[PDB]
Amino acid sequence: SVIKPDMKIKLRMEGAVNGHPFAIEGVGLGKPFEGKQSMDLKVKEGGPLPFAYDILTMAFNRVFAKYPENIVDYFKQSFPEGYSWERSMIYEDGGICNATNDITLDGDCYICEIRFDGVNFPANGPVMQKRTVKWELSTEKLYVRDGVLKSDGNYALSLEGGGHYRCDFKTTYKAKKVVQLPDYHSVDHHIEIISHDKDYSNVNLHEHAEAHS
């Protein structure tokens, strides 16, 4: 097999938010069977970021999700060839972000190439005014359509002072070879910025994910 109990991560994101470009690089460590990963992220271009870092964190790999035996694991099957995803994130105040990721494997290291593009975030909204605190537990619902795997989720950012800010996610996952397709199921995600410096130029990000049906 190519999926080891301990795996490394190398990533680069290039993007823009409201037309202002940035680039971030990351290195990390994960446990694919435990559904846990941690990474250190560094802003390389476009800092200090003028928007809430929280809109980026889900963009920074479902191979790091604990799948039980009675649910088909689309992601672990896809390697060594890998898979890609495409995603839209629609915020309740009309901000919309698109992103793509292409995930390959080199030795014991996942390499991720991410593109991120957000538009129409209001100047006095919680994204541009950096008023977000954390994502709540996020439940992704996955289903097959047209021979590939789709998902969506209704997620919520908690806000400074209280209340929530809603975002709907839609993702399409595409394996780069023929794999067994799963039945309908869910993945619960806990995502958390563990530490960061003042302007978020340095971030430590952790994720824990588990599939259920």
Domain locations in the chain as residue ranges: 1-213
Residue-wise burial string across 10-46, b where 16 or more C-beta atoms lie within 10 A, e elsewhere? bbebbbebbeeebbbebebebbbbebbbbbbbebeeb
Helix (H, G, I), strand (E, B) or coil at 22: strand
Method of determination?
Answer: X-ray
The residue among 159, 155, 160, 151 whose CA lies nearest residue 186 is 151
| Consecutive H or E run containing 123 | none
The residue among 1, 202, 9, 191 whose CA lies nearest residue 101 is 9
What phi and psi, each to the nearest 5 degrees, are found at residue 69? -65, -25
How far does CA 41 lie from the centroid of its chain?
13
CATH topology (fold) of 1-213: Green Fluorescent Protein (2.40.155)
Q: What is the resolution of this structure in A?
A: 1.8
Distance from the first to the final alpha carbon of the chain:
26
The residue among 33, 183, 186, 30 whose CA lies nearest residue 110 is 30
- The size of the chain, in residues, is 213
* Residue 197 token pair: 């410096």
Amino acid at 121: F
